[PDB]
Amino acid sequence: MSKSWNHDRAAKHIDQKIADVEEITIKDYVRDMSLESIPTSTAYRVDGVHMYADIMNLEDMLNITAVEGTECHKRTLRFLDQHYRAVKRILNKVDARRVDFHSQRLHSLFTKPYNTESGAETKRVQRAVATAQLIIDVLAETGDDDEQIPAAKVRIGIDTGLALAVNNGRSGYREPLFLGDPANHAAKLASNNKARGIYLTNNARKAIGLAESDEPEKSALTAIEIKACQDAAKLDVTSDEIVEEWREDLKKNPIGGYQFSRQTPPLRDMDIYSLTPANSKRQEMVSLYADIDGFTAYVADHINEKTDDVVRTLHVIRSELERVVTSDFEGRRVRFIGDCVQALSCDGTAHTTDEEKSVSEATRLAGALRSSFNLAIERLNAEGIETGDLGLAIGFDLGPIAVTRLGAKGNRVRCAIGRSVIESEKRQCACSGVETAIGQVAYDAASKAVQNLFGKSRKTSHLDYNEATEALA
């Protein structure tokens, strides 16, 4: 139960991780290689098309009523589960990779055909567009009126380019994640505003012979443009085939009921990999995002030259931030989303959350994360590893949060959801690489000392562990 950060303990673990990544192997991803269970010391340069599908009406499900109650969460989870199952079936059918499903954003990757084939990149983009429209068509049909579950309102972003594949740091280190421009830029297009449709970067537009746009985020593909991609890609999978299979899956092996229990403290003991709808976890707690600021551009700068230092930097920083969350502060790392850490923190008893204490300890955790980040940069640089212009943006908020695994057996994905999850990320995104921000709900529940620290702006700079300790004395 002790929650404390220590410079010596952090330095020792950072130094050990630096030693582990002394030798790095960078491989160019070609046919017959595998992106599963990538070792710590290895990374793959992947030329691929990234699609991000944003289910825009998630936030509406979370806000059906003023109070964020149990029924709100059960219906939100069933909505995400139904729609995820449909998309995952589509991706399986077209032999694309499901990278992750983070909140309402579903990331997929198209790597085939390979560049040995003439016009491969054009064909990858065409396949991604055709698959995107299949997602849109299907997700109009995968609600359930009887359960008050709406159809999904979909906005899609697509980019093409190079990324660096490393293991995703969770669940036995099996599945990869993909660092660099294309997943990031695809996600930005997908989340830019609330207009439905399929939005390509200028890279992706150029690859399929379309004129570049001064504002790609406002230039949806037309029906005619999409049809050209469909006719070229020849998916030979129809929306009706997907829906019939999706319905059969749910009939034979239904979702069943969502049922919630609290996590026995400490939160680090949550066994996410084992959760199911009937065994979901839920309680008021703090959602925290710690984003390595500037990391995407750093990868882009190094995608071809000095790529090995990227791998060293990523593993040293992410492993240490995870250790601070889990071992120093007894919290739970949910996932990494690209380079960013998604975490949970809680204080209280087996029966109730201590809101004020949870927010104070999250403030201390935020300081500890920054102290460990700063120390990791120092130690990396002292060993001659280039770390560019990296920073750490942190946001956190308080509210009821449910954790489960969505999907059919063999095709599941973890989900942590709540208004405070969504809002903690928005607070994080408002921060520079030296800033830490708090949500309004957390602020309102906080001690006077925490309120004074964050002030009117609900944000502060250079909040390291020493500063947090002194502010909360």
Question: Computed over its alpha carbons, how large is the radius of gyration of the chain?
Answer: 22
Q: Please give the Cα distance from 29 to 101 (Å, whole number).
A: 23
Binder among 111, 133, 168, 184 for ligand ATP (CB under 6 A):
184
The CA-based angle 420-278-398, given to 5 degrees, is: 15
Total residues at the site for ligand ATP (CB under 6 A)?
A: 20
Residues contributing to the site for Mg ion (CB under 5 A): 455, 457
Does 255 sit near Ca ion (CB under 5 A)?
Answer: no
Q: Please give the Cα distance from 324 to 5 (Å, whole number).
A: 7
Choice between 126 and 424, CB closer to Ca ion: 424
Contacts of 432 by beta carbon, 8 Å cutoff, 6+ apart: 293, 391, 393, 461
Instruction: State the nearest-atom distance from the C-beta of 428 to ligand ATP, in Å.
Output: 8
Does 110 sit near Na ion (CB under 5 A)?
Answer: yes
Dmax over CA atoms of the chain, in Å, equals: 66
Residue, CB closest to ligand ATP: 338
Choice between 48 and 216, CB closer to Na ion: 48
Q: Please give the Cα distance from 228 to 226 (Å, whole number).
A: 5
Interaction pattern, residues 423-442, with ligand ATP; x per rule: CB under 6 A: ------x-------------
Q: Please give the Cα distance from 445 to 423 (Å, whole number).
A: 15
Choice between 127 and 459, CB closer to Mg ion: 459
Which partner from the list Ca ion, Mn ion, Na ion, none does 292 bind, CB cut-off 5 to 8 Å by kind? Answer: Ca ion
Q: Please give the Cα distance from 104 to 426 (Å, whole number).
A: 14
Does 294 sit near ligand ATP (CB under 6 A)?
Answer: yes
Residue 55: both structure tokens together: 């289910």
Interaction pattern, residues 251-290, with ligand ATP; x per rule: CB under 6 A: ----------------------------------------
Residues contributing to the site for Mn ion (CB under 5 A): 291
The CA-based angle 164-165-169, given to 5 degrees, is: 125
Which partner from the list Mg ion, ligand ATP, Na ion, none does 294 bind, CB cut-off 5 to 8 Å by kind? Answer: ligand ATP
Strands 97-102 and 105-110: antiparallel
Residue 58 · residue 104 · CB < 8 Å: yes
Which partner from the list Mn ion, Mg ion, Na ion, none does 331 bind, CB cut-off 5 to 8 Å by kind? Answer: Na ion
Contacts of 65 by beta carbon, 8 Å cutoff, 6+ apart: 72
Does 331 sit near Na ion (CB under 5 A)?
Answer: yes
Residue 168 · residue 158 · CB < 8 Å: no
Residues 331-350 that bind ligand ATP (CB under 6 A): 337-339
Does 93 sit near Na ion (CB under 5 A)?
Answer: no
3-state secondary structure of 21: coil
Measured in whole angstroms, how far is the alpha carbon of residue 256 from the centre of its chain? 26
Residue 35: both structure tokens together: 């992106």
Interaction pattern, residues 286-325, with Ca ion; x per rule: CB under 5 A: -----xx--x------------------------------
Q: Please give the Cα distance from 464 to 473 (Å, whole number).
A: 14
Which partner from the list Na ion, ligand ATP, Mg ion, none does 308 bind, CB cut-off 5 to 8 Å by kind? Answer: none
Binder among 5, 178, 396, 454 for ligand ATP (CB under 6 A):
178
Residue 373 CA: distances (Å) to CA of 167, 391, 413, 469: 21, 8, 29, 17
Does 395 sit near ligand ATP (CB under 6 A)?
Answer: no
Instruction: State the nearest-atom distance from the C-beta of 302 to Na ion, in Å.
Output: 25
Which partner from the list Mg ion, Na ion, Ca ion, none does 455 bind, CB cut-off 5 to 8 Å by kind? Answer: Mg ion
Which partner from the list Ca ion, Mn ion, Na ion, none does 339 bind, CB cut-off 5 to 8 Å by kind? Answer: Ca ion
Contacts of 133 by beta carbon, 8 Å cutoff, 6+ apart: 198, 226, 229, 230
Interaction pattern, residues 288-327, with Na ion; x per rule: CB under 5 A: ----------------------------------------
CA nearest to 176, candidates 188, 163, 185, 186: 163
Which partner from the list Ca ion, ligand ATP, Mg ion, none does 97 bind, CB cut-off 5 to 8 Å by kind? Answer: none
CA nearest to 140, candidates 60, 198, 101, 82: 82
Does 179 sit near ligand ATP (CB under 6 A)?
Answer: yes
Contacts of 252 by beta carbon, 8 Å cutoff, 6+ apart: none
Instruction: State the nearest-atom distance from the C-beta of 337 to ligand ATP, in Å.
Output: 5
Does 112 sit near Na ion (CB under 5 A)?
Answer: yes
Residues 78-137 that bind ligand ATP (CB under 6 A): 105, 107
Task: Indicate if the alpha-carbon torsion angle 81, 83, 86, 92 is positive or negative.
Answer: negative
Choice between 327 and 457, CB closer to Mg ion: 457
Compute the half-sphere exposure of residue 264: CA atoms within 13 Å on the CB side of its CA: 2
Q: Footprint of Ca ion on this chain (CB under 5 A)?
A: 291-292, 295, 339
Question: Where do contacts with ligand ATP occur on this chain (CB under 6 A)?
Answer: 105, 107, 177-179, 183-184, 187-188, 191, 291, 293-297, 337-339, 429
Provide the binding-site residues for Na ion, judged by CB under 5 A.
2, 96, 110-112, 328-331, 345
